[PDB]
Design a protein around this ligand. Sequence first.
Ligand SMILES: O=C(O)c1cc(O)cc([C@H]2CCN[C@@H]2C(=O)O)c1
Ligand SMILES: O=C(O)c1cc(O)cc([C@H]2CCN[C@@H]2C(=O)O)c1
Lengths: 258, 260
Amino acid sequence: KTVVVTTILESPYVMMKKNHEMLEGNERYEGYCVDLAAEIAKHCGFKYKLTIVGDGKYGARDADTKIWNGMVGELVYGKADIAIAPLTITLVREEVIDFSKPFMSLGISIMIKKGTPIESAEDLSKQTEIAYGTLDSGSTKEFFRRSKIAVFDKMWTYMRSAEPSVFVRTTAEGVARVRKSKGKYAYLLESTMNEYIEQRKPCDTMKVGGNLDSKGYGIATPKGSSLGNAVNLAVLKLNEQGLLDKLKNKWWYDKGEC
Amino acid sequence: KTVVVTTILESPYVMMKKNHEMLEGNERYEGYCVDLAAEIAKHCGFKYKLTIVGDGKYGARDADTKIWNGMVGELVYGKADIAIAPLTITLVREEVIDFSKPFMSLGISIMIKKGTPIESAEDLSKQTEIAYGTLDSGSTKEFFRRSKIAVFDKMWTYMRSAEPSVFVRTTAEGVARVRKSKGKYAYLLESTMNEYIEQRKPCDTMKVGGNLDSKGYGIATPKGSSLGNAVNLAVLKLNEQGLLDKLKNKWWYDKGECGS
Ligand SMILES: O=C(O)c1cc(O)cc([C@H]2CCN[C@@H]2C(=O)O)c1
Ligand SMILES: O=C(O)c1cc(O)cc([C@H]2CCN[C@@H]2C(=O)O)c1
């Protein structure tokens, strides 16, 4: 049976080729996760169809209805067989699906517009002139809410009370906010996205400071899936053989623009 | 039955306390992995016994005999229930035991004597006056042997043919060699150990450059063990709650001897 892969349209993980109207099926798309899906399938010996997650979401359980959205939802309700995407390995997700070991590492990080006199989280925490914030909901916002670290706690109390709101609706809005705010806004987002944008025109942003936490992206299959074991071994082999590092370099830097 | 934990005496992971003689059982020991064991056990609801791996090894399969040694071996052959140690998640190990998601990230990194004019692997590869090497067997050596990366290929060829030998038998030997070599020896080792040593007296070494690869330490259980599921969930909760970062900072930096 053909394996149904769910993934998400987000550069540079999955894009539609410029000539996509000339192509069919899996060949319409390109990117990091497109290449990885190919390697995973080759190493596990399956045929697959790439599909884009219906609701454009990653995977969250609605606190009221208990329903899972996004790619995780597509796995647990049987719409797809495997998710290959920048999907963070988290406890609540691990409880309902299986994750491979991580294929990429990342953490919360600071994006500034080039020129901004900020080099770290401590720098942000001790001032208020350069506003800074996060997505208006999600794990990053929650990281700050629950932090007991002095710097991060100070950043959190600043963010919640700051006027006007320092929170944004989408990461795209956050990046745009940095870019148009004339050095007066910094945005807190995944290091992977931060590092990618730094290599996109007009090359006006920069990742600064170390990551504030650590996590990884993992390939997700449903509990008891016949694919889980082989997929996991595949990730480790690709890492050990240098392929994941080669793939990140390809999509972030060789194809960079700055 | 009380869970049998196997681990290895390696600082700052597991250390005998200075007054260990006045103590008994698990209380004899301290370190990152001792703290981690307590938190894993707490969240999973089991009591445990910390035991030290009999043969002093991590886990490799002999090519000829095909026996697994070290902590992996103790799990594979049923001598221990769980391994909690700086044990790298690797493909060959993953095939014979179960691993939690990683509790610590790391990679191959360069240690220099403070003052050595070297910032990267590429720097090392382009010259010979500063000799450089690694453990004389194991994954870091094999990483270089098999690499297709031009720079690492060049370093492997250099290392294999360099005289006198640039390899060392142990980590301690490697560190001692860097420190006593007046800047003419650099040592390739795990970033985690590199970072630790930089915070130890006499504060005469430093980590330089990015890591050359990426991997993680994982909590290991025998394949199919009922402990695997809860232990993995525990690791994830501890990471997301900030505890793993807290333990790292505690043992590497709060207890560091070279200051901020
Ligand atoms: O850091 C956040 O606050 C955040 C909020 C979201 O709504 C989505 C994400 C995505 C981006 C890709 N990986 C995350 C994931 O897999 O869930 C991150
Ligand atoms: O970097 C090496 O080449 C290397 C060689 C070894 O013989 C042992 C180790 C240990 C140290 C802790 N983690 C590794 C592990 O889990 O195997 C590392």
